[PDB]
């Protein structure tokens, strides 16, 4: 049930998240685009400084009034094929170099931590206050800087499949925001798109998003969702922790199979007033796919001895998840102290650097960084025993991969439905059926993906916002409106891209999308979308 205090907590968390996102965008522009800075910041340094900025801003608000506050999703920066989970610690740089020596150059940006021109850099971060969560994620593009022009600008737009993915993600974000705002004024929904007396459904959400992805020649990556957020239950760890009640729309390999053929999420819900919704969309480019295939995910481990593949990424995840249903008294004192701090954190994913007493640093000093690393080594000693007894788990690093359908059809699985990975640590993905109609399990699909020579990786673009449906009473101006807690035209401003595709106007769904864009651009007699503003810094 919404209230003024709940709305204020959401607004404060959203403002903190917007300010942090603006900070990291400015840092990237200064390091790579403005090029005024002497030293180029790398990915782990960006993540660490972002988390410190979030904590220092959050210290000033809701002191001695709220039991729990902090970082909801640790600052993640993902590059091209890497679809999420990339928040490396600062003490893993030499490890990454040593592990990936003798590999390809395909993951060079993530291995080195230095960005390169043409990279799709996805920034994701979230803030929770009293369990009320706001999350934001934006894709930006790294361009080469022009020299002849007086003013620092890119030499050209981003072109190709990466541009297609960025455009698909951005347009899907805008259309979904408009559609969910139409739930407050159902009479404003375009007639062709849906009924005047009909509400907003997950079916309509899915078909609009699929129409846009199909128009831009992209797939929807299986981690995408448009779900409802409640207190302490935001899907901060959706692939790891289970939930009793779920209201939203997801995309999976099973949904891809059903589309090609034509606690459990389902698109049989009506978007109601007075609720908070998270919209997270990942679009994978299908530029290099000359056939029809399936979009899946490959998990990253830290073992270089598991194969001889040159284009494999070896890395260790930086974010851990505490399982409060598991109890075990540890044998190491360092382990017991670390567990005490981890239980102090909460039900959100955490970094080991977040647990240091020095962090966040008041003054960015070489000795402060050194003291943080000194704490980090002992933290790793404790963490090994904590994870060896299943008290914490790793939130995975995932890469979007493409598997053609002919290989899946020709492949033979003697076990069918019955096969499942019994060595998997997590129960939720271990007991998974990506293809219920074909009887192909997760371990079988991973085997097929690894056996294929035409199983390539796909660049991914990401857009993720949080919105609240404010009623006539809750809103200021006595009319219902959509309050966007994060994202919009101030922070998630699109990069310079150009695509060869566009929505073909001879489609009813496309016409409905265009009518929604018209009603959004109208501010008098249309939709009311109020964007949350970042606070000032200097």
């Amino acid at each position: 049930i919404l209230q003024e205090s709940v709305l204020n907590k959401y607004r404060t968390a959203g403002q903190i998240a917007q300010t942090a996102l603006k900070y990291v965008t400015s840092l990237i522009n200064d390091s790579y685009h403005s090029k005024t800075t002497q030293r180029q910041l790398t990915v782990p340094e960006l993540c660490l400084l972002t988390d410190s900025f979030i904590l220092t801003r959050l210290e000033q608000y809701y002191k001695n009034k709220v039991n729990e506050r902090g970082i909801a999703i640790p600052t993640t920066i993902d590059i091209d094929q890497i679809s999420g989970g990339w928040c490396p610690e600062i003490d893993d740089t030499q490890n990454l170099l040593n592990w990936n020596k003798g590999k390809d150059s395909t993951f060079a940006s993530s291995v080195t931590g230095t960005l390169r021109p043409g990279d799709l850099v996805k920034i994701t971060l979230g803030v929770h206050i009293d369990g009320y969560t706001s999350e934001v994620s934006h894709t930006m593009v790294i361009y080469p800087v022009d020299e002849t022009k007086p003013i620092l600008q890119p030499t050209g737009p981003l072109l190709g499949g990466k541009a297609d993915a960025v455009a698909a993600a951005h347009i899907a974000m805008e259309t979904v925001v408009a559609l969910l705002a139409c739930a407050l004024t159902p009479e404003k929904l375009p007639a062709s798109l849906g009924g005047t007396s009909s509400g907003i459904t997950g079916q309509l959400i899915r078909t609009i998003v699929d129409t846009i992805a199909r128009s831009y020649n992209c797939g929807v990556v299986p981690g995408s969702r448009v779900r409802r957020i409640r207190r302490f239950l935001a899907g901060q760890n959706e692939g790891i922790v289970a939930e009793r009640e779920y209201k939203g729309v997801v995309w999976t390999e099973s949904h891809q199979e059903a589309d090609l053929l034509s606690a459990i999420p389902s698109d049989d819900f009506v978007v109601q007033s007075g609720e908070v919704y998270l919209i997270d969309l990942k679009m994978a480019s299908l530029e290099h796919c000359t056939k029809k295939g399936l979009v899946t995910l490959e998990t990253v481990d830290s073992y270089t001895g598991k194969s001889h593949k040159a284009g494999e990424l070896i890395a260790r995840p930086g974010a851990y998840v505490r399982d409060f249903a598991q109890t075990h008294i540890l044998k190491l004192k360092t382990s017991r102290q670390l567990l005490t701090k981890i239980d102090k954190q909460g039900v959100y994913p955490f970094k080991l650097s977040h647990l240091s007493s020095n962090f966040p640093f008041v003054h960015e000093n070489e000795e402060e960084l050194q003291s943080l690393k000194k704490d980090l080594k002992s933290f790793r000693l404790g963490m090994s025993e904590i994870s060896n007894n299943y008290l914490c788990v790793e939130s995975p690093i995932q890469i979007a991969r493409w598997v053609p359908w002919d290989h899946i059809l020709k492949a033979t699985n003697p076990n069918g439905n019955l096969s499942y990975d019994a060595t998997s640590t997590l129960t939720l993905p271990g007991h998974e059926l990506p293809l219920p109609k074909l009887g192909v399990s997760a371990i079988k699909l991973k085997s097929l993906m690894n056996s294929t020579k035409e199983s390539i990786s796909l660049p991914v673009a990401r857009e993720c916002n949080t919105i609240v449906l404010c009623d006539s009473s809750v809103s200021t101006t006595d009319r219902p409106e959509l309050l966007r807690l994060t994202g919009g035209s101030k922070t998630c401003q699109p990069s310079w891209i150009h695509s060869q595709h566009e929505l073909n106007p001879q489609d009813s769904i496309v016409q409905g999308i265009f009518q929604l864009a018209t009603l959004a651009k109208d501010k008098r007699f249309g939709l009311l979308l109020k964007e949350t503003q970042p606070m000032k810094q200097k």
Partner: peptide, 26 residues
């Protein structure tokens, strides 16, 4: 056979542009 029919159905099935942003750094 439902598996046979699903496999044959899948076999039968598989058998200006736009601009965003501009020359400036957001």
């Amino acid at each position: 056979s439902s598996l046979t029919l699903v496999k044959e159905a899948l076999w039968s099935v598989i058998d200006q542009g736009t601009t965003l942003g501009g020359p400036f750094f957001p």
